[PDB]
Amino acid sequence: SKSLSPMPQIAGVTYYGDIPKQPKRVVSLASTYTGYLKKLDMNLVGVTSYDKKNPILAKTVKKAKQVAATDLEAITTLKPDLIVVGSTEENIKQLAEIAPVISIEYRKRDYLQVLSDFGRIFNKEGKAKKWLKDWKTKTAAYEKEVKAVTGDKATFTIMGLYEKDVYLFGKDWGRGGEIIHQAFHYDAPEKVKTEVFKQGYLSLSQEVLPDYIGDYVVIAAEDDKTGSALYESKLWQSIPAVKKHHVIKVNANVFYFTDPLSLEYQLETLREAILSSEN
Numbered sequence: 001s002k003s004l005s006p007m008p009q010i011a012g013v014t015y016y017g018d019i020p021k022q023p024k025r026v027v028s029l030a031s032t033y034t035g036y037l038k039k040l041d042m043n044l045v046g047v048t049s050y051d052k053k054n055p056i057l058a059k060t061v062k063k064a065k066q067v068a069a070t071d072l073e074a075i076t077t078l079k080p081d082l083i084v085v086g087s088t089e090e091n092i093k094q095l096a097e098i099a100p101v102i103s104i105e106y107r108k109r110d111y112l113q114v115l116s117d118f119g120r121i122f123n124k125e126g127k128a129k130k131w132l133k134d135w136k137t138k139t140a141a142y143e144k145e146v147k148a149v150t151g152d153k154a155t156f157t158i159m160g161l162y163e164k165d166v167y168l169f170g171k172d173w174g175r176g177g178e179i180i181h182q183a184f185h186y187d188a189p190e191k192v193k194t195e196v197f198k199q200g201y202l203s204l205s206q207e208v209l210p211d212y213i214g215d216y217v218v219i220a221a222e223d224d225k226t227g228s229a230l231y232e233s234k235l236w237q238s239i240p241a242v243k244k245h246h247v248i249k250v251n252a253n254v255f256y257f258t259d260p261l262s263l264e265y266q267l268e269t270l271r272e273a274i275l276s277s278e279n
């Protein structure tokens, strides 16, 4: 049998079976966590659709098979020694019959803590610690670069377009919020803090958008055409941030994510976009 993880008790983490310390064949069914596993040099043999559509992650998991959580046959045939899932998956019992499962409840641990937590689970403390130390220094330095342009008290709002809907996001639901609000310590407008931050996201009707945007808005979308009717509208064009050219449009296929690999890309992209806003 496998050498075992110490299986520390951590908020949001549930273990089904004896988790290996050094898994050799991991199936990641929670796109939130795939890039954490890759940062810790895990061999991923299965990943999901969102992972394959994230160009930053995809380059690192070319040999992994795309699977869904319902793919019991394909997952079995991949011969995993570990499956990682989100807590809202509904067939965890069946997955746990294939291999040991780590189930993670989103948001119980923050985007940085999740990495050090995996460091404890897999005895990869050194790799996690080095990444986190560098991240702390780099983000502080980049915070200074961007605030030199915007001022330190500029407000930012995180937004996403999905289907025909409009979402606002807080500091810990992806779409750049970890970068903007946690790493760069930008404030959000009061209405966003009051109405969005606690839930993490808020589906909004388009006509109230001006009320939630201050100095800057970051907008995630999967394709560049979705926002067209909004962007040309008198409503949108009336927003001061839009008039000032303080709109930063980002690609959701990577900006949905919160993992170290995706966030490295988001960090450089957002740094450059803020600097570029004053060209």
Ligand code: NA
Residues within 6 Å of the ligand: 030, 031, 032, 033, 085, 086, 087, 106
């Ligand atoms: Na998840």
Ligand code: NA
Residues within 6 Å of the ligand: 153, 154, 155, 214, 215
């Ligand atoms: Na302001």
Ligand SMILES: [Zn+2]
Residues within 6 Å of the ligand: 018
């Ligand atoms: Zn045992």
Ligand SMILES: [Zn+2]
Residues within 6 Å of the ligand: 090
């Ligand atoms: Zn259900």
Ligand SMILES: [Zn+2]
Residues within 6 Å of the ligand: 163, 164, 165
């Ligand atoms: Zn809708």
Ligand SMILES: [Zn+2]
Residues within 6 Å of the ligand: 243, 245
């Ligand atoms: Zn203009």
